[PDB]
Design a protein around this motif. Structure first.
Motif, mmCIF file in Angstrom:
data_model
loop_
_atom_site.group_PDB
_atom_site.id
_atom_site.type_symbol
_atom_site.label_atom_id
_atom_site.label_comp_id
_atom_site.label_asym_id
_atom_site.label_seq_id
_atom_site.Cartn_x
_atom_site.Cartn_y
_atom_site.Cartn_z
ATOM 1 N N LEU A 118 45.895 49.680 44.730
ATOM 2 C CA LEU A 118 45.308 48.615 43.955
ATOM 3 C C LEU A 118 46.248 47.443 43.905
ATOM 4 O O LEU A 118 47.447 47.644 43.845
ATOM 5 C CB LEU A 118 45.029 49.085 42.544
ATOM 6 N N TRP A 119 45.698 46.232 43.926
ATOM 7 C CA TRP A 119 46.494 45.027 43.931
ATOM 8 C C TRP A 119 46.154 44.142 42.744
ATOM 9 O O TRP A 119 45.061 43.578 42.670
ATOM 10 C CB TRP A 119 46.259 44.254 45.218
ATOM 11 N N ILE A 120 47.077 44.010 41.803
ATOM 12 C CA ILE A 120 46.788 43.171 40.672
ATOM 13 C C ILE A 120 47.542 41.907 40.937
ATOM 14 O O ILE A 120 48.723 41.870 40.653
ATOM 15 C CB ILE A 120 47.194 43.783 39.274
ATOM 16 N N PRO A 121 46.862 40.853 41.454
ATOM 17 C CA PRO A 121 47.510 39.566 41.711
ATOM 18 C C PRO A 121 48.176 39.070 40.431
ATOM 19 O O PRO A 121 47.823 39.542 39.330
ATOM 20 C CB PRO A 121 46.335 38.632 42.045
ATOM 21 N N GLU A 122 49.101 38.112 40.587
ATOM 22 C CA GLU A 122 49.981 37.578 39.511
ATOM 23 C C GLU A 122 49.558 37.785 38.035
ATOM 24 O O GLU A 122 49.810 38.859 37.436
ATOM 25 C CB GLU A 122 50.331 36.107 39.796
ATOM 26 N N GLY A 123 48.929 36.761 37.456
ATOM 27 C CA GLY A 123 48.403 36.881 36.097
ATOM 28 C C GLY A 123 46.911 36.627 36.147
ATOM 29 O O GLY A 123 46.415 35.663 35.542
ATOM 30 N N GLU A 124 46.191 37.481 36.880
ATOM 31 C CA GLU A 124 44.808 37.175 37.165
ATOM 32 C C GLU A 124 43.800 38.070 36.468
ATOM 33 O O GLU A 124 42.625 37.691 36.311
ATOM 34 C CB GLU A 124 44.566 37.058 38.666
ATOM 35 N N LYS A 125 44.266 39.227 36.011
ATOM 36 C CA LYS A 125 43.399 40.163 35.298
ATOM 37 C C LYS A 125 42.234 40.608 36.193
ATOM 38 O O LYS A 125 41.101 40.816 35.725
ATOM 39 C CB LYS A 125 42.915 39.551 33.972
ATOM 40 N N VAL A 126 42.535 40.727 37.491
ATOM 41 C CA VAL A 126 41.638 41.347 38.478
ATOM 42 C C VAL A 126 42.370 42.502 39.166
ATOM 43 O O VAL A 126 43.596 42.488 39.239
ATOM 44 C CB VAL A 126 41.090 40.323 39.539
ATOM 45 N N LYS A 127 41.642 43.500 39.660
ATOM 46 C CA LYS A 127 42.257 44.543 40.480
ATOM 47 C C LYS A 127 41.474 44.703 41.784
ATOM 48 O O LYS A 127 40.241 44.780 41.791
ATOM 49 C CB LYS A 127 42.331 45.888 39.750
ATOM 50 N N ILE A 128 42.204 44.777 42.890
ATOM 51 C CA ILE A 128 41.596 44.745 44.189
ATOM 52 C C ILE A 128 41.927 45.997 44.993
ATOM 53 O O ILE A 128 43.089 46.257 45.311
ATOM 54 C CB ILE A 128 41.927 43.426 44.892
ATOM 55 N N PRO A 129 40.893 46.809 45.276
ATOM 56 C CA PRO A 129 41.065 47.948 46.145
ATOM 57 C C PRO A 129 41.579 47.461 47.472
ATOM 58 O O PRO A 129 40.957 46.601 48.086
ATOM 59 C CB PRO A 129 39.644 48.498 46.272
ATOM 60 N N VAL A 130 42.733 47.964 47.890
ATOM 61 C CA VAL A 130 43.327 47.527 49.154
ATOM 62 C C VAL A 130 43.748 48.687 50.030
ATOM 63 O O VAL A 130 43.818 49.823 49.584
ATOM 64 C CB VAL A 130 44.521 46.564 48.929
ATOM 65 N N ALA A 131 43.991 48.393 51.295
ATOM 66 C CA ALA A 131 44.679 49.314 52.182
ATOM 67 C C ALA A 131 46.039 48.715 52.489
ATOM 68 O O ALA A 131 46.136 47.592 52.972
ATOM 69 C CB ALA A 131 43.905 49.548 53.427
#
Ligand SMILES: Nc1ncnc2c1ncn2[C@@H]1O[C@H](COP(=O)(O)OP(=O)(O)NP(=O)(O)O)[C@@H](O)[C@H]1O
Length: 307
Positions: free
Chosen positions: A34-47
């Motif tokens: 999971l990738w939580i960009p800087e201060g974005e309050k999003v989570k991104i399923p990643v490889a």
């Protein structure tokens, strides 16, 4: 040519949790994460793909070339490159394709895959390639193994470890997938968008036969000669002549005689409005096709745009 103004994003290691291993061996190790960009309050399923620990100049040279390509493409049917992480061992961060690659998906699911899906994939693969073609870019390694499944209704082209950009690329040495390559490619190391078309046909044939191995049994050495004889791959059981005819067209010696991806889109898309006319599969009509308490702020990469 136009200036390539794609942005390359550099990600802090601290911006992303790894969670599970997906691949391991053939070059690097791939992770679900999971990738939580800087201060974005999003989570991104990643490889996440870093390379087999110990580092060689020879290796980084390729992962970065790959990253160059992947960052310069933006189409719904080409893999989304998210950014790189410059830790001792360079990590490639891409969109998690949860259902894995298409080749595996067809094998593991043959008794539930219908003509609608098959032709849709064909169409979607064609659009990826047409797009690459507009960006004047030659994949040189299209194959069922290099198309990933984000969901069964959405596939995307991947693997740019050979991708190139001139009328025909004039390669050197290296290990090449013989059983997918045009003849001009096998004998002169010429690669055009039309040799990509040829590998398309083979990919389609891989799908229609639920993931067979082309010329299984025949060794790479003979192939050039076999295709010179006038031999192509057999007609898949489930395939109407119509569909197979399109496949054969892909595998013609005069490369200008083969169809253009933009034509392949048209033809498969026609067929895809009446799937059962063009693909005969037992059971068709009666066939159809994440896991964290913490998944509140999850957003697929495809909804995570940046300027
Ligand atoms: N972005 C992704 N999302 C989900 N699964 C992936 C992703 N990338 C790779 N995988 C899986 O991991 C397997 C192996 O990783 P990958 O790097 O794609 O293959 P490889 O054997 O190193 N060679 P290539 O086919 O050229 O990439 C793939 O076949 C997929 O099943």
């Amino acid at each position: 040519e136009a200036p390539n103004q794609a942005l390359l994003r550099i990600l802090k290691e601290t911006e992303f949790k790894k969670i599970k291993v997906l691949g391991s061996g053939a070059f690097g190790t791939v992770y679900k994460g999971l990738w939580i960009p800087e201060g974005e309050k999003v989570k991104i399923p990643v490889a996440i793909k870093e390379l087999r620990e110990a580092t060689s100049p020879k290796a980084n040279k390729e992962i970065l070339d790959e990253a160059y390509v992947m960052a310069s493409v933006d189409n719904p049917h080409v893999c989304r490159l998210l950014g790189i992480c410059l830790t001792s061992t360079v990590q490639l961060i891409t969109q998690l394709m949860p259902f894995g690659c298409l080749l595996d998906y067809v094998r593991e699911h043959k008794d539930n895959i219908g003509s609608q899906y098959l032709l849709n994939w064909c169409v979607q693969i064609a659009k990826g390639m047409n797009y690459l073609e507009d960006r004047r870019l030659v994949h040189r390694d299209l194959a069922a193994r290099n198309v990933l499944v984000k969901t069964p209704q959405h596939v995307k082209i991947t693997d740019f470890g050979l991708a190139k950009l001139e009328k025909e690329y004039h390669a050197e040495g290296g290990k090449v997938p013989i059983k997918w390559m045009a003849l001009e490619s096998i004998l002169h190391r010429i690669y055009t968008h039309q040799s990509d078309v040829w590998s398309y046909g083979v990919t389609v044939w891989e799908l229609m036969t639920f993931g067979s191995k082309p010329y299984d049994g025949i060794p790479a050495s003979e192939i050039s000669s076999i295709l010179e004889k006038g031999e192509r791959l057999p007609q898949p059981p489930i395939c109407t002549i119509d569909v197979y005819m399109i496949m054969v067209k892909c595998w013609m010696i005069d490369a200008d005689s083969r169809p253009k991806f933009r034509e392949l889109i048209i033809e498969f898309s026609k067929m895809a409005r009446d799937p059962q006319r063009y693909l005969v599969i037992q059971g068709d009509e009666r066939m159809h096709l994440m896991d964290e308490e913490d998944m509140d702020d999850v957003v697929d990469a495809d909804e995570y745009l940046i300027p």
